[PDB]
């Protein structure tokens, strides 16, 4: 059938006219097949014969196997047609779904061909079946329904479906319907008998609106496989993950492995993909074999242990609170579980993101909390109560002193080691009885040669030569020198805000080797005081280093 | 009553902005508001033929209010509300003893919106866990938040205000978006009496911070130089650096003598004759406004904020970097305090120039996007970008 629902008004792009694409002469089998397919569609009112006056044309093709299918190439009309609103913003997560006693899966028959097209737009869908060797005029047809492959079909079908369902939804508020393409997922708390009746009421309401559905003897049964998940009555999991046993792994094999692991990480806790992702770096042939590192081999083995036993997830109960727990599972690696009743997980997840160049555990945990917060608002429309492996005092000392505004919702410390801590603290004021290292670095923009050095109040002086370095690098190598040649307590004066900014932020992990070498030094020290002075202002100490550092064109 | 034709320009398409995830309570509040607005004919449910989108939020006392983020639309409609139908800004507003802010957005609901423009006001009420398609609507009337609404209404606003303006020539009224800025040099009791008088005029026709604003008292936060009994090498270095960066803004700043004195940071150095004079002379320069800096009405206003710790926040408004048009300060949690500061700075920016500044926010995009709506109270939204505050700029501004 063709729904009695009012048509959605369609337009072409402002300065555009309909497609006028020439029909390529086709094979006799294809002409025969198209005529056959078209006559049956015309008789159903899907298409309608048109006069010679209509100037628009879209090419048609036929592909065969015993059945023949009509293939219209809407490439040009799609380019000329207006933009439509996005079909759906996202896909429901099983963890967000509430328990339903009974479930029925209904599929709409010939979906697009059951929805009318805007009368004013029909002319643009015009196509011609060529005559044998294009000798005589072909058979001209236009669509009356939503054509397959046209830009506006997914959007118009869903809105029509949403309009049709609206009265039923209002009349049955306790029934749940999920629309996805040609499919309809109906759920209710009613007992098997009462449910089967309401399904028929819906099918009848759908038929009243030109939409066919399969009868009670054609529907799906046992554990529902939906969108890559296994939906059981009181629990959910992801569809079975086959971690292949391979002696040799191609780029393609690793790419698929990672995807399957990332998919598994929604419910399987502790899944790691870092060392395997390191193998994907380098841009190599997709068929190219990559030798697995010991770190990747260890990671793959740890994942195989997690996946050896099937792990399930629970459904959402709006009456209970959401609890999110985070654990540090290595450097830059974070793992989380979300539950309502202790250790009966709704969902699982991981976070590993290097925001910027250098970072610390306190920043990483806050970013991990933020990622989970947004996720929780999507799935449940509310934030969870957090359980973090950081002391309230560590957090307080960090946030109050940090330049950035940081705010995390209701949380509690949980003693799940490794714990989040500040590896070193920089001094608030200068140190008495401590050597003051005035540092400087200058690299020749042309020769790329650099010079990093220091001058002290204790009289010490040192200058080192660097190959293929920037000024950013030399100023950093200068601070490393001061930390290398100093004792447990030190005062460091620099003219680099870049270096100051990095160090001031208390990093414990970095992309740069130099920064990690500096970090390693900062932890060893008992006291460190970092100060800044404006370069080339004739400041005592700064001017002294500048002299011995600028030597050799700088 | 008939529609005023609205144009975006021969080019420039409408807004296609993503809707940030909303909480359960905020979604529910929006469906209640929108059902009432649909019934009243203010908005209408839309089909997929409208590809446009503008974000919506729900803000607050106890009652929920709908807040539409028309930032992209306002940007795309600039020719209309600014050049074609611009509301002029009075220089007198900033000079008044007391300024009162009154919401007048309810006046736009009585005026119809150009049929051909309506599609650009499209918004979405999303569903939790993407379980339902998402309620789509568009406006039939002038929408609150859009800069085109007061531009069209100004003609009707002048008629409403005509008697009150005639009876009170020394009172200045400025229309900015959904609000009226009412300034007078009257005593607080008399000022409040005149506000209530104006409310009655609006009643016929159908209509941080504090009780009022005091822009005549809005003084700049001068760059403060420490007054010390004893000065260490480090103290001078901090003072040399602070004055060196101030010399980039304030014409006349000198460091020369202070620079004149390889030593340990902890070592004390006695304060010289010419350096003591230099310090006192610079102190007098920082007290007064920046010489050479003027507001360019064709240039965008930019605002920087620094978290000073202990509930303290510093800010600067400029058009050309570091050339300050205004500097100031603001005094439970980091985000709540920051939203309060943003609103306060925006309110001042409106009073002084008749424009909002683009904010350089010292916060992670995600954290702000999640929490700003929880504490926001204004009808408008300024432009914002997320920035990493340079460690020195915090120290230089106290
Ligand atoms: C997104 C989605 C996918 C499928 C499928 N496919 C079915 C539906 C109605 C669906 O949409 C929604 C919307 C709101 N809550 C729930 N609650 C769900 C919670 C999980 N149960 C699982 C379940 C599995 C079997 C049976 S049976 C074999 O007992 O009828 C009852 C419930 C399904 C509804 N599902």
Q: Most A CBs within 10 Å: which of B13, B47, B120, as the mutation test of the A interface?
A: B47
Q: Both B121 and B51 in a single domain?
A: yes
Burial of B300 (0-12, 13-18, 19+ CB in 10 A): exposed
Rg (CA), chain A: 34
In degrees and rounded to multiples of 5, residue A145 shows phi and psi of -110, 175
Which residues is A140 bridged to in the sheet? A128
Question: Which residues make beta-bridge pairs with A442?
Answer: A451
Give the nearest chain A residue to B389 (CA atoms).
A403
| Structure tokens given for B139 | 């406006």
- State how far the Cα of B23 lies from the Cα of B261, in Å rounded to an integer: 60
The number of angstroms, rounded, from the C-alpha of B267 to the middle of its chain's C-alpha atoms is 46
Regarding whether B239 and B165 lie in a shared domain, the answer is no
Do B254 and B186 fall within a single domain?
Answer: no
User: Cα distance from B184 to chain A (closest Cα, Å)?
Assistant: 37
H/E/C letters for each residue in A57-85? ECCEEEECCCCCEEEECCHHHHHHECCCC
- Rounded to the nearest angstrom, the distance between the alpha carbon of B45 and the centre of ligand 1 is 29
Do B79 and B120 belong to one domain? Answer: yes
- Which backbone phi and psi does B279 adopt, to 5 degrees? -60, -45
How far from chain centre, in Å, is Cα B254?
Answer: 35
Dist. CA B383–CA B358, nearest whole Å: 5
Residue A19 neighbours by CB under 8 Å, 6+ apart:
A56, A57, A58, A76, A77, A80, A124
For residue B131, which atom of ligand 1 is closest to its CA?
13
Among candidates B351, B360, B350, which has minimal Cα distance to B380?
B350
Chain A residue with minimal CA distance to B14? A83
Q: Which residues of A are annotated as a binding site for Mg(2+)?
A: 107, 182-183, 440, 475, 495, 546
Please state whether beta strands B312-318 and A139-143 pair in parallel, antiparallel, or not at all (unpaired).
unpaired
CA distance A206 to A212: 7
| DSSP of A464-483 | EEESS--HHHHHHHHHHHHH
- Spatial separation of the C-alpha atoms in residues A72 and A175, rounded to whole Å: 39
Give residues 72 to 91 of A whose Cβ lies within 8 Å of B: 82-85, 88-91
**Alpha-carbon A372 to chain mean position:** 13
Angle at which helix B188-203 crosses helix B148-167, to 10 degrees, equals 120
User: Phi, psi (5° rounding) for residue B361?
Assistant: -80, 125
Annotated binding-site positions of A: 107, 182-183, 440, 475, 495, 546
Q: Is A315 in the pocket of ligand 1 (CB under 6 A)?
A: yes
Contact B239, B286 (CB under 8 A): no
Q: Do A403 and B362 touch (CB under 8 A)?
A: yes
Q: Which residues from chain B sit within 8 angstroms of residue A179, using beta carbons?
A: 133
Task: Taking each helix axis as running N to C, give the angle between helix A513-524 and helix A497-504, from 0 to 180 degrees, rounded to the nearest 10.
Answer: 60
Distance from CA of B42 to the nearest CA of A (A): 21
Chain A residue numbers touching B237 (CB-CB < 8 A): 493, 531, 533, 539
| Token output for A79 | 């380019």
Calpha distance A380→A318 (Å, rounded): 8
- Chain-chain contact of B23 with A158 (C-beta, under 8 angstroms): no
Instruction: For residue B287, give both structure tokens.
Output: 């007290």
Domain boundary among B215, B233, B267: B215
Ligand 1 centroid to B28 CA: how many Å?
23
Q: Give the number of other CB atoms < 10 A from CB of residue B360.
A: 18
- Of residues B255, B225, B392, B265, the one with CA closest to residue A542: B265
Q: Can you tell me which atom of ligand 1 is nearest the CA of A102? A: 30
Please, are residues A47 and A41 in contact by the beta-carbon 8 Å criterion?
yes
Query: In 3-state terms, what secondary structure has residue A192?
Result: helix
- Residue B87, class by beta-carbon neighbours within 10 Å (0-12 exposed, 13-18 middle, 19+ buried)? middle
Identify which of A159, A92, A86, A85 has the alpha carbon closest to the alpha carbon of residue A381: A92
How many angstroms separate the CA atoms of B326 and B321, rounded? 12
Closest atom of ligand 1 to A221 CA is 28
Do residue B15 and residue B123 come from a single domain?
yes
CA distance A124 to A142: 8
Q: How far apart are CA B278 and CA B257, in angstroms?
A: 7
**Burial state string for A25-49 with b = 16 or more CB within 10 A and e = fewer than 16:** ebeeebbebbeebbeebeeeebbee
How far CA A160 is from CA of A155, A165, A210, A445, in Å, comes to: 9, 9, 11, 65
Domain with B312, as residue range(s), is: 216-317
CATH number of the A88-112+154-222 domain: 3.30.70.270
Candidates A493, A278, A343; CA nearest to B265 is A493
Put the strands of the sheet holding A385-388 in their side by side order: A345-351, A334-339, A323-328, A385-388, A411-413
Chain B contact present for A510, CB below 8 A: no
Pocket test for ligand 1, best of A93, A97, A223, A379 (most atoms within 8 A of CB): A97
How many domains, chain B?
Answer: 4
Angle formed at CA B145 by CA B142 and CA B150, multiple of 5 degrees: 55
For residues A177 and B131, give the distance between their C-alpha atoms in angstroms, rounded to a whole number: 8
- The residues spanned by each domain of chain A are 1-87+113-153, 88-112+154-222, 223-316, 317-423, 424-549
**Which stretch of DSSP H or E encloses residue A363?**
helix A361-380
CA pair distance B334, B316, nearest whole angstrom: 19
**Rounded to whole angstroms, how far apart are CA atoms A277 and A350?**
14
Alpha-carbon dihedral sign for residues B27, B31, B32, B36: positive
Q: Does A367 touch chain B (CB under 8 A)?
A: yes
Distances (CA, A) of B293 to A283, B234, B256, B314: 52, 32, 25, 20
Angle at B172 between CA B166 and CA B177, to 5 degrees: 115
Smallest CA–CA distance from B48 into chain A, residue: A85
Q: Is A439 left (phi over 0), alpha (psi -120 to 50) or beta?
A: beta
- B118 with B259, same domain: the answer is no
End-to-end Cα separation, chain A, in angstroms: 82
Ligand 1 atom with the smallest distance to the CA of A315 is 19
Question: What class has domain A1-87+113-153?
Answer: alpha beta
Record: contact B261-A540, CB cut-off 8 A? yes
**Distance from B333 to chain A by nearest Cα, in Å?**
7
> Shortest Cα distance from A531 to chain B (angstroms)?
8
The dihedral formed by the CA atoms of A154, A159, A161 and A167, expressed in degrees to the nearest 10 = 170
Select the residue of B19, B264, B370 nearest A374 (Cβ to Cβ).
B370
Angle at B332 between CA B327 and CA B336, to 5 degrees: 60
Per-residue H/E/C for chain B: CCCCCCCCCCCCCCCECCCCCCCHHHHHHHHHHHHHHHHCCCEEECCCCCCCEECEEEECCCCCEEEECCHHHHHHCHHHHHHHCCCCCCCCHHHCCEEEEEECHHHHHHCECCCCCHHHHCEEECCHHHCCCCEEEEECECCCCCCHHHHHHHHHHHHHHHHHHHHCCCCEEEEECCEEEEEECCCHHHHHHHHHHHHHHHHCCCCCCCCCECHHHCCCCCCCCCCCCCCEHHHHHHHHHHHHHHCCCCCCCCCHHHHCCCCCCCCECCCCHHHHHHHHHHHHHHHCCCCCCCCCCCCCCEEEEEEEECCEEEEEEECCCCCEEEEEEECCCHHHHHHHHHHHHHHHHHHHHCCCCEEEECECHHHHHHHHHHHCCCCCCCCEEECCCCHHHHHHCC
Residue A233 in 3-state DSSP? coil
Token pair 């506006």 is at which residue?
A152
Assigned token pair, A450? 């650099």
What's domain A223-316's superfamily in CATH? Reverse transcriptase/Diguanylate cyclase domain (3.30.70.270)
- End-to-end Cα distance, chain B: 55
Q: Which two tokens stand for residue B11?
A: 């080019």
Q: Mark the binding-site residues of B, compressed into ranges.
A: 103, 178-179
Residue A400: HSE in the Cβ half-sphere, 13 Å Cα cutoff: 8
> Cβ–Cβ contacts within 10 Å for residue A125, how many?
23
DSSP A113: G
Which secondary structure element, helix H or strand E, spans residue A104, and what is its range? strand A102-107
Q: Please tell me the distance from the alpha carbon of residue A83 to that of residue B48, in angstroms, as a whole number.
A: 9
- Which of A159, A407, A540 is the closest to B334 by Cβ? A407
For A459, counting Cβ atoms within 10 Å of its Cβ (0-12 exposed, 13-18 middle, 19+ buried), the class is: exposed
Q: What angle do CA B302, B303, B307 make, to 5 degrees?
A: 155
Report the nearest-CA residue for atom 34 of ligand 1. A100
Quick one: residue A512, left, alpha or beta (phi over 0 = left, psi -120 to 50 = alpha)?
A: beta
Task: Determine which residue's CA is closest to atom 23 belonging to ligand 1.
Answer: A233
In this structure, is the dihedral angle defined by the CA atoms of residues B249, B255, B258 and B260, taken in order, positive or negative? positive
| Positive or negative torsion for Cα B108, B113, B119, B120 | negative
Closest-CA residue of chain A to B243 = A534
Could you say which DSSP state residue A117 is in? -
For residue A102, the SS3 value is: strand
Based on the fold, state whether residues B44 and B124 are members of the same structural domain.
Answer: yes
Residues B128, B63 share a domain? yes
CA atoms within 13 A on the CB side of B133: 28
Q: Is B196 in the pocket of ligand 1 (CB under 6 A)?
A: no
Name the minimum distance, in Å, from the CA of A460 to any CA of chain B: 11
- Which fold would CATH assign to domain A424-549? Nucleotidyltransferase; domain 5 (3.30.420)
Q: What is the spatial distance between Cα B259 and Cα B256, in angstroms, rounded to a whole number?
A: 5
Same domain, B42 and B120: yes
Whether residue A145 has its Cβ less than 6 Å from ligand 1: no
User: d(Cα A451, Cα A454) in Å, to the nearest integer?
Assistant: 10
In this structure, the answer to whether residues B276 and B313 fall within a common structural domain is: yes
Instruction: Report phi then psi at A501, rounded to 5.
Output: -50, -45
What are the structure tokens assigned to A138, written together? 């072909």
3-state SS string over B302-319? EEEEEEEECCEEEEEEEC
- Both B100 and B183 in one domain: the answer is yes
Best of B133, B308, B371, B393 to disrupt the A interface (most A CBs within 10 Å) is B133
DSSP A401-456: HSSSB----SEEE---SSPB--S----SSPPTT--EEEEEEEE-TTT--EEEEEEE
| φ, ψ (nearest 5 deg) of residue A491 | -115, 125
Of the candidates B60, B149, B187, B265, the residue with the CA atom closest to the CA atom of residue A539? B265
3-state secondary structure at position A339: strand
| Distance, C-alpha A454 to centroid of its chain | 47
**Cis amide leading into A82 (omega within 30):** no
CB pairs under 8 A between A and B: 187
The reply to whether ligand 1 has any atom less than 6 angstroms from the CB of A127 is no
- Measuring CA to CA, which residue among A128, A133, A139 is closest to residue A28? A133
Element (H, E) at A296: helix A294-308
* Structure tokens given for B86: 């611009």
Strand locations in A235-384, DSSP E? 236-238, 323-328, 334-339, 345-351, 358-359
Considering only CB atoms, A406 lies closest to which of B128, B136, B334, namely B334
**With left for phi above 0 and alpha for psi between -120 and 50, is residue B145 left, alpha or beta?**
left
Residues 6+ apart with CB under 8 A from A79: none
What tokens does A491 get?
């005062």
Just give the CATH number of A317-423.
3.30.70.270
Work out the angle at residue A429's Cα, subtended by the Cα atoms of residues A426 and A431, and round it to the nearest 5 degrees: 85
Find the CB nearest B244 among A11, A97, A534.
Answer: A534
d(CA A492, CA A437): 5
Counting every residue written for chain B, the total comes to: 398
Same CATH topology for A1-87+113-153 and A88-112+154-222: the answer is: no
Pair of tokens at residue B205: 């026709």
Q: Which residues of B are annotated as a binding site for Mg(2+)?
A: 103, 178-179
The answer on B139 and B33 residing in a single domain is yes
Q: What is the 8-class DSSP label of residue A97?
A: P
What CA–CA distance (Å, rounded) separates B118 from B122? Answer: 8
**Alpha carbon A297 to its chain's center:** 26
Strands A411-413 and A385-388: parallel
Q: Comparing C-alpha atoms, which of B162, B183, B164 is closest to residue B174?
A: B183
Report DSSP letters for A138-178, one per residue.
Answer: -EEEEESB--TT-TTHHHHHHHHHHHHHHHHHHH-TT-EEE
The tokens describing B18, both together, are: 């993503």
The rounded distance, in Å, linking the Cα atoms of B188 and B183 is: 11
Query: Which residue in chain A is spatially nearest to B245 when comparing CA positions?
Result: A534
Cα B283 to Cα B309: distance, rounded to the nearest angstrom? 25
């Amino acid at each position: 059938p063709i729904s009695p629902i009012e048509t959605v008004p369609v337009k072409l792009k402002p300065g555009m006219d309909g497609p006028k694409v020439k029909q390529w002469p086709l094979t006799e089998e294809k002409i025969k097949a198209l005529v056959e397919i078209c006559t049956e569609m015309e008789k159903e009112g899907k298409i309608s014969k048109i006069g010679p006056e209509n100037p628009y044309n879209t090419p048609v093709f036929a592909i065969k196997s015993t059945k023949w299918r009509k293939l219209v190439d809407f490439r040009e009309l799609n380019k000329r047609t207006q933009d439509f609103w996005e079909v759906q913003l996202g896909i429901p997560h099983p963890a967000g779904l509430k328990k339903k006693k009974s479930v029925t899966v209904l599929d709409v028959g010939d979906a697009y061909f059951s929805v009318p097209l805007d009368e004013d737009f029909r002319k643009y869908t015009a196509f011609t079946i060529p005559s044998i060797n294009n000798e005589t005029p072909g058979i001209r047809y236009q669509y009356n329904v939503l054509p397959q492959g046209w830009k506006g079909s997914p959007a118009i079908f869903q809105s029509s479906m949403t309009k049709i369902l609206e009265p039923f939804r209002k009349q049955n508020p306790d029934i749940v319907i999920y629309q996805y393409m040609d499919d309809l997922y109906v759920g209710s708390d009613l007992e098997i008998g009462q449910h089967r009746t309401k399904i028929e009421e819906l099918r009848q309401h759908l038929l009243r609106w030109g939409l066919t559905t399969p009868d009670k003897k054609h529907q799906k049964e046992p554990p529902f496989l939906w969108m890559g998940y296994e939906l059981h009555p009181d629990k959910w999991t992801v569809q079975p993950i086959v971690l292949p046993e391979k002696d040799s792994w191609t780029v393609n094999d690793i790419q698929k492995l990672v995807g399957k692991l990332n998919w598994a990480s929604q419910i399987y806790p502790g899944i790691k993909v870092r060392q395997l992702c390191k193998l994907l770096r380098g841009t190599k042939a997709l068929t190219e074999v990559i030798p697995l590192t010991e770190e990747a081999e260890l990671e793959l083995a740890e994942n195989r242990e997690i996946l050896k036993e099937p792990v399930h997830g629970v459904y959402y109960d709006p009456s209970k609170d959401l609890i999110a727990e985070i654990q540090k599972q290595g450097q830059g690696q974070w793992t989380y579980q979300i539950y309502q009743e202790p250790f009966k997980n709704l969902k699982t997840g991981k976070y590993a993101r290097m925001r910027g160049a250098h970072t610390n555990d306190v920043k990483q945990l806050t970013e991990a909390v933020q990622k989970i917060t947004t996720e929780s608002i999507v799935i449940w429309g509310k934030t969870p109560k957090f359980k973090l492996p950081i002391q309230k005092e560590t957090w307080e000392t960090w946030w109050t002193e940090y330049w950035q505004a940081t705010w995390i919702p209701e949380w509690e410390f949980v003693n799940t080691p490794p714990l989040v801590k500040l590896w070193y603290q920089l001094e608030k004021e200068p140190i008495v009885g401590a050597e003051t290292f005035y540092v400087d670095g200058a690299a020749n923009r042309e020769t790329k040669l650099g010079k990093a050095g220091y001058v002290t109040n204790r009289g010490r002086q040192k200058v080192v030569t660097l190959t293929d370095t920037t000024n950013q690098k030399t100023e950093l190598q200068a601070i490393y020198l001061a930390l290398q040649d100093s004792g447990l307590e030190v005062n460091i004066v620099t003219d680099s805000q870049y270096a100051l900014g990095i160090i001031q932020a208390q990093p414990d992990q970095s992309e740069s080797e130099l920064v990690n070498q500096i970090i390693e030094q900062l932890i060893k020290k008992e006291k460190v005081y970092l100060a800044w002075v404006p370069a080339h202002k004739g400041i005592g100490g700064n001017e002294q280093v500048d002299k011995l550092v600028s030597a050799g064109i700088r | 009553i008939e529609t005023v034709p609205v144009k975006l320009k021969p080019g420039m398409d409408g807004p296609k902005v993503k809707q940030w995830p909303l909480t359960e309570e905020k979604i529910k509040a929006l469906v209640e508001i929108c059902t009432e607005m649909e019934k009243e004919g203010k908005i209408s449910k839309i089909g997929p033929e409208n590809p446009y989108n503008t974000p919506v939020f729900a803000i607050k006392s106890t009652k929920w209010r709908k807040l539409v983020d028309f930032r992209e639309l306002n940007k795309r409609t600039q020719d209309f509300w600014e050049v074609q139908l611009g509301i002029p800004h009075p220089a007198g507003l900033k000079k008044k003893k007391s300024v009162t802010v009154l919401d007048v957005g309810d006046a736009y609901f009585s005026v119809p919106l150009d049929e051909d423009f309506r599609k650009y006001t499209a918004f979405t009420i999303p569903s939790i866990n993407n379980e339902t398609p998402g309620i789509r609507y568009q406006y039939n009337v002038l929408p609150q938040g859009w800069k085109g609404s007061p531009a069209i209404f100004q003609s009707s606003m002048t008629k409403i205000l005509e008697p009150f303006r005639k009876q009170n020539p020394d009172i200045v009224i400025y229309q900015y978006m959904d609000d009226l800025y009412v300034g007078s040099d009257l005593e607080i009791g008399q000022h409040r009496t005149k506000i209530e008088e104006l409310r009655q005029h609006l009643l016929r026709w159908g209509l941080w911070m504090g009780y009022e604003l005091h822009p005549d008292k809005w003084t700049v936060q001068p760059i403060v130089l420490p007054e010390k009994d004893s000065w260490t090498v480090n103290d001078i270095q901090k003072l040399v650096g602070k004055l060196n960066w101030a010399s980039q803004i304030y014409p006349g700043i000198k460091v020369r003598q202070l620079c004149k004195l390889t030593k340990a940071l902890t070592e004390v150095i006695p304060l010289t004759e010419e350096a003591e004079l230099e310090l006192a002379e610079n102190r007098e320069i920082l007290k007064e406004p920046v010489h050479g800096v003027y507001y360019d009405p064709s240039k965008d206003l930019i605002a920087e904020i620094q978290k000073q710790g202990q509930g303290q926040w510093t800010y600067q408004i400029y058009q050309e970097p570091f050339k300050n048009l205004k500097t100031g300060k603001y005094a439970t949690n980091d985000v709540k305090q920051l939203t309060e500061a943003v609103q306060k700075i925006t309110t001042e920016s409106i009073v002084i120039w008749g424009k909002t500044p683009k904010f350089k926010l010292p916060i992670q995009k995600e954290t702000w996007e999640t929490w700003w709506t929880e504490y926001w109270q204004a009808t408008w939204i300024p432009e914002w970008e997320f920035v990493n505050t340079p460690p020195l700029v915090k120290l230089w501004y106290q």
